[PDB]
């Protein structure tokens, strides 16, 4: 088992709305949960977009999840990662 490296990035403000992307990388096995929370609670999957869990060419995997958030509300959001019975949480930077 290799634990994921989790990283949160944010795009520029489109129309007062930021896109936040939570990336998990360099993990094994392939089974992972990666999802956005607001005010400590998981969002609906219909408010998010997920990449596939793809190889990185080193015997490990990588994936991502994104959601759109209104400007000034970024501190309410947390990326939740779960892998092999472990979890980690990651707030929105800047």
């Amino acid at each position, epitope marked *: 088992t290799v634990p994921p490296m989790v990283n949160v990035t944010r795009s520029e403000a489109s129309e007062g709305n930021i896109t936040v992307t939570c990336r998990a990388s360099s993990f094994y096995p392939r089974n992972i949960i990666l999802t956005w929370r607001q005010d*400590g*609670v998981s969002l609906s999957h219909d408010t998010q977009q997920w990449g596939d869990v793809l190889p990185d060419g080193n015997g490990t995997y990588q994936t991502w999840v994104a959601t759109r958030i209104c400007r000034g509300e970024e501190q309410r959001f947390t990326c939740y990662m779960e892998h092999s019975g472990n979890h980690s949480t990651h*707030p929105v930077p800047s």
Partner: antibody
Amino acid sequence: QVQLQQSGAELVRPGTSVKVSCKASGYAFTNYLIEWVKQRPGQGLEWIGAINPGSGATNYNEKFKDKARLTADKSSNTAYLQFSSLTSDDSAVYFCARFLGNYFDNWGQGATLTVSS
Amino acid sequence: DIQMTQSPASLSASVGETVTITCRASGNIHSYLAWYQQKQGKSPQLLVYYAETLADGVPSRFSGRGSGTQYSLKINSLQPEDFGSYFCQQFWTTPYTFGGGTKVEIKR
């Protein structure tokens, strides 16, 4: 309405194990992460770890990885913190808390753990 | 690991005075900081989150300010119910870390 009610004071022997509880009410138990915190008078507040009561998946402070075990029983809305190989260093007040949007709220009343022969 | 440096460790003030408690983080915590009150080691009570947002039910005399690595809690017109302990906590990275606390005692 939201309440985290912990178990009472514990008087326990060195070398033994003990499990203290945190019973949640007034909200959907599986939706929020439960947090555990240690407090002593000498060396301040320390975060032990978090658990997702929906899946049981844990996020430990590396310092408590050998000492602490976090579990949750979602049928009784109760989270647990178990200590192994108790020493005098474990004598402290232990709090549970609730993870909101990137801050803690709804701290339990605390449970005192006293290790003694 | 973010180290939180809270000063001063103790503070003597009278009713009506204004007091300020500072917390300095070892790295940028992006305003993910909360302040809590604690009386006699009892349940911590949330005062301020996201560095400056005052929590529900908290008197407007409490004021949180800061960004980056520099944060402060100000108590304007200190009341008898404000004597006790205060601590900051950061939520930018795990493990979550706490300031060493400030005991606010009655000056005489």
